Amino acid sequence: SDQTWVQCDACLKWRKLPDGMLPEKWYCSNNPDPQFRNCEVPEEPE
C-alpha cells in the first residue's frame, strides 16, 4: 500500500488521509478533503 486511515472520534468512521500526515482527537470536520468533512458521509471501502 499503504493507505493511511484515521478514525473520527465522534462517528467512528474511518477516513482516508494523504500520505505523510495529527491531534490526539480527530474528527471528520478536520478532514483536508472537503468531500469527507461531515460525519454523515458514508465510510469509503478499503
Binding site: S1, W5, K25, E46
Partner: peptide
Amino acid sequence: ARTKQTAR
C-alpha cells in the same frame, strides 16, 4: 489520533 494503514 487513531490511525491504521491498509495495503492499497
